[PDB]
Design a protein around this nucleic acid. Structure first.
Lengths: 50, 126, 62, 174, 52, 99
RNA sequence: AGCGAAUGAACUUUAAAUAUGUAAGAAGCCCUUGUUACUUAACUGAACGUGGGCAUUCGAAUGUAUCGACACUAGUGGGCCAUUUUUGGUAAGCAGAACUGGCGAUGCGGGAUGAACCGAA
């Protein structure tokens, strides 16, 4: 219970912390580049022929 | 150059000497020396046939062979973590020894001051 | 807890005997003191916790 | 292509110890979504300069919306299209309320009239004719003309396609 | 004997995630933004935005 | 979250057993600190130190065909109007249709 | 890319894509010290012995429906077509190599129909 309470917190802060930095850099006169994604889901949608 | 029975060599096949040249399949390959003669040398080179592999013992002259430095990485890396492991155990601070495959880039900012962007057309006219 | 993350671990039977082994395991995963099979090196993290206390990374008094 | 949007794409070469703080290029791109706007940015940039996707990064992507999508503007598009002979310039004009509606009508026009595909059309410049009497095409000038008013002859009724039979014959005066 | 979707029946959801009760009770999925008057976009960002 | 809750299955002694209880997570991944199904969500999403072991414990997800279908020209690039390749955040619309 | 670096595909600070050889520990490393039937001016090399560290990150990623040695036992040892690369030639066809893929032992959906097409076993 306590660990998932902690986990759902960081899901909220990480969204807000990425949002606020793009807002701050915009106002300060800069551009913020988010981190390239560290997780990829791959779905195979075509059969193995030829 | 001195070549010992049982070392890794690279076969380049120079076109200056027409004697003792191999086929173009053994040009630009890497094998192991197993027999040394007065003027030629014998190299075992793996070859691919369909799904399996076959070892072919061919004769290459001295003028076409060259030593490989694939041992250069392995000997350098084996020493390199060994001295650090000696150092890290002496210091009592844990140290990463393996090599990590090039993580994604993190997040940062870019100031537009002194670097006002220039707008480009799809094609260049000037 | 705030210095070294320290999520809520299980105190198990009694108090202190099993909590130290739990608090070292979470510190090993967070700091990076794992094993060859991914196991948490309890001796490494407890040394790393001892490394922090002698260096002053933990606060306390009598 | 579909619900096109117009994106501002800022990109630059990857920073280097020898060359810190790179040139920071910018292009305006008409793309259906973000992932092709980034792809079309690196397509053009590798054509002009040496910078490529592996050696570069995208600084920002921001959509741009019309100032006034409820006012009717005359737009002039200069474009360069590739045919089986070579590259040619055109200046086409269209009457819309937005810049994405300008290029949406452009791609439908070039496909219908010259059989041009998306990878052959280069949108050079899209301008809004801020004042009239700068319109130079006869079809658009025809719409701009004073106290314009036309009827609508031979308007077919909208009869439902599942109403197979009807009793009364339809009229075409509405 | 029968696979049960936690997204369909909330008893298996409460079996797996006990926090699902307090998540719905305190409306964590409807958290509002922090207060504060949002400052206007810089005028320099606007002229960049419609340069050409 | 919906991939693990709905189509989540494990590798316990080489068998595909669904994660119906929190207990079977601990008996196979509890030596890495993963004892709940929220732990497995956290490890997969925010890529952690035990991602090597969590992803292989996860059986490959047997998804269905997408509801509504693919695009008309399926075997072209996503940047060229099709479905093959990298689509970044647009994989979520495909996940919702297939799962 | 540059030659507001030098020099001039045969220019290079740098460096592609793209296929394609070779290595990525404990069955491993280095050097110290001794011998030999081999070799060298010479433990200079090869071999036999000696010493050490790390076994709770033992030295990239991903996967792993086990792997290896020995012995014994059946059926096989034809080709046709296409992509790409490549050698030669014709007025044009065409002929020959190498890789891969399909059909050969393969049913189903589609292309009205179909050995060689598309999807999918």
């Amino acid at each position: 219970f306590k660990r998932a309470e902690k986990y759902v917190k960081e899901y909220r802060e990480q969204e807000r912390e990425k949002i606020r930095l793009a807002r701050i850099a915009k106002q300060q006169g800069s551009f913020h580049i988010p981190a390239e994604a560290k997780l990829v889901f791959v779905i195979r949608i075509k059969g193995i022929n030829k | 150059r001195t070549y010992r029975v049982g070392d890794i060599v690279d076969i380049k096949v120079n076109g200056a000497v027409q004697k003792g040249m191999p086929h173009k399949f053994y040009h630009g390959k890497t094998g192991v020396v197993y027999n040394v003669t007065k003027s030629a040398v014998g190299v075992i080179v793996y070859k691919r046939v369909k799904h399996r592999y076959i070892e072919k013992r061919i004769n290459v002259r001295i003028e076409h062979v060259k030593p490989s430095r694939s041992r250069e990485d392995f000997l350098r890396r084996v020493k390199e973590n060994a001295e650090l492991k000696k150092k890290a155990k002496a210091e009592g601070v844990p140290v990463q020894l393996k090599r990590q495959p090039a993580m994604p880039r993190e997040a940062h900012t870019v100031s537009i001051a002194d670097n006002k962007p220039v707008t480009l057309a799809p094609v260049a006219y000037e | 807890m705030q210095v070294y993350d320290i999520p809520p671990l299980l105190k198990d039977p009694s108090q202190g005997g099993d909590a130290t082994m739990d608090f070292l395991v979470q510190v090993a995963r967070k700091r990076g003191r794992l094993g060859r099979g991914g196991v948490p090196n309890i001796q490494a993290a407890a040394m790393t916790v001892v490394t922090d206390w002698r260096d002053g990374r933990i606060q306390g008094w009598t | 292509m579909g619900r096109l949007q117009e994106y501002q794409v800022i990109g630059r070469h990857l920073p280097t110890e020898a060359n810190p703080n790179p040139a920071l290029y910018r292009m305006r791109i008409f793309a259906p979504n973000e992932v092709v706007a980034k792809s079309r940015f690196w397509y053009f940039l590798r054509g002009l300069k040496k910078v490529k996707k592996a050696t570069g990064e995208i600084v920002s992507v921001n959509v741009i919306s019309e100032k006034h999508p409820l006012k009717v503007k005359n737009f002039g598009i200069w474009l360069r299209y590739d045919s089986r002979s070579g590259t040619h310039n055109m200046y086409k004009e269209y009457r819309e309320t937005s810049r994405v509606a300008a290029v949406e009508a452009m791609y439908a026009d070039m496909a219908a009239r010259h059989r041009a595909r998306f990878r052959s059309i280069h949108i050079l410049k899209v301008v809004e004719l801020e004042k009239t009497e700068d319109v130079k095409r006869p079809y658009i000038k025809q719409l701009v003309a004073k106290n314009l008013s036309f009827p609508l002859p031979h308007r077919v009724p909208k009869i439902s396609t599942k109403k197979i039979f009807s009793a009364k014959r339809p009229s075409t005066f509405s | 004997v029968q696979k049960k979707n936690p997204l369909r029946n909330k008893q298996i959801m409460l079996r797996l995630n006990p926090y699902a009760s307090t998540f719905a009770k305190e409306k964590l999925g409807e958290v509002k933004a922090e207060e504060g008057k949002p400052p206007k976009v810089p005028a320099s960002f606007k002229e960049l935005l419609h340069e050409a | 979250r919906e991939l693990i809750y709905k189509r989540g299955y494990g590798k316990v002694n080489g068998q595909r057993i669904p994660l119906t209880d929190n207990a079977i997570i601990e008996e196979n991944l509890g030596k890495y600190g993963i004892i709940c199904i929220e732990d497995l969500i956290h490890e997969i999403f925010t890529v952690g130190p035990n991602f090597k072991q969590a992803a292989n414990f996860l059986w490959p997800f047997k998804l269905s065909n997408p509801n509504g279908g693919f695009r008309p020209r399926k075997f072209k690039h996503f940047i060229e109007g099709g479905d093959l390749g990298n689509r970044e955040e647009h994989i979520n619309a495909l996940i919702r249709a297939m799962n």
